[PDB]
Design a protein around this nucleic acid. Structure first.
Ligand code: CA
Length: 224
DNA sequence: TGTATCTT
DNA sequence: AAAGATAACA
């Protein structure tokens, strides 16, 4: 096998792979790759499944869709692998972390794997993008798939913190039982929207408050 | 030059 | 659906 989709996630989501919408979606993505550059590369569409067991997810960060520039997106929302510098969205995330978490210091890179390993699911609502065109693969099938991810977690986990960043991610909110999980919503951290509430949202400290109240270990946001 | 959300 | 307006900053 290719080992692209983590095993505990495949166990609970592989049913989607036999559904017409998903078969047609992956066909659409393959047709796009034939004529255009699509991000992330094929082996990294599902990196978000490879960092921790699905049963160990404690926090879900949901963005819009992947970065659309060369060598940026690698399947963890808002993350970029070294040596690529943090894009403007991630610099804004770091800026809010710096005011929200007193101990947080800019790490010098943009790889968020260290949050994902602690059980922060770094998901985007749409999981591919045509180069240079933000949200170009919306409404093609990804939303049903990431709905299935959110629905599984909603039903099988307890006390999750969902952070829905941007209008497209917030479409998932209706699916989440608010008396069982915690949903925090704010604007996307892109410079094009950050001033609509992201700065000052304090989601990182709020997340840890909620985890600690429910007996769970907080996220160490400096562990990158 | 580039990186959302609203209105028509 | 999508063009354009609105939006803040480098
Ligand atoms: Ca991304």
């Amino acid at each position: 096998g290719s080992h692209m989709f983590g095993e505990s996630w495949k166990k609970h989501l592989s049913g989607e792979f036999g559904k017409p919408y998903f078969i047609k979606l992956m066909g659409f993505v393959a047709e796009e790759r034939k004529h255009y550059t699509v991000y992330p590369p094929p082996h990294q569409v599902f990196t978000w499944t490879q960092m921790c067991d699905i049963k160990d997810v404690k926090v879900v960060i949901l963005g819009q869709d992947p970065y659309h520039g060369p060598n940026q997106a690698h399947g963890l929302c808002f993350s970029v692998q070294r040596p690529v510098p943090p894009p403007p969205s991630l610099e804004n995330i770091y800026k809010e972390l710096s005011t929200d978490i007193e101990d947080f210091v800019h790490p010098g890179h943009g790889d968020l794997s260290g949050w994902a390993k602690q059980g922060v699911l770094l998901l985007n609502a749409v999981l591919t993008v045509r180069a240079h065109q933000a949200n170009s693969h919306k409404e093609r099938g990804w939303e049903q798939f990431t709905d299935a991810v959110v629905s599984w977690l909603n039903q099988n986990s307890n006390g999750l913190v969902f952070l829905l960043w941007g209008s497209y991610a917030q479409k998932k909110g209706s699916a989440i039982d608010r008396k069982r999980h915690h949903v925090l919503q704010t604007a996307h951290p892109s410079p094009l929207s950050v001033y609509r509430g992201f700065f000052g949202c304090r989601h990182f400290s709020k997340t840890n408050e909620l985890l600690q109240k429910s007996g769970k270990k907080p996220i160490d946001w400096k562990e990158l």
